[PDB]
Amino acid sequence: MTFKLIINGKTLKGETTTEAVDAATAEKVLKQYANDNGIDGEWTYDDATKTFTVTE
Numbered sequence: 001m002t003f004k005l006i007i008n009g010k011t012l013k014g015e016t017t018t019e020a021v022d023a024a025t026a027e028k029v030l031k032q033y034a035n036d037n038g039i040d041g042e043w044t045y046d047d048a049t050k051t052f053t054v055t056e
Contacts, residue, residue, distance in 0.1 A: 005030045006053035007039060027052060 003026035005016045016033050020026030023045060030052055031043075041056040 001026075001050070003030065004051050005033065006051060007034055007056070008054060009039065009056045011056075012037075023047070023050070023052075 007014045018026050018029045041054050044053045
């Protein structure tokens with residue numbers, strides 16, 4: 001299952017995808033991708049659309 005990351009950055013926006021089996025499996029790599037760029041804020045997750053969005 002392919003996931004999609006949504007980094008709603010007012011100063012710097014971006015996105016990335018990673019192959020995973022569960023929302024927790026992908027979030028593990030996704031959360032690291034954002035954090036690596038000094039990104040931190042309101043982390044949200046959707047089970048219906050299966051997409052993650054972070055409102056900085």
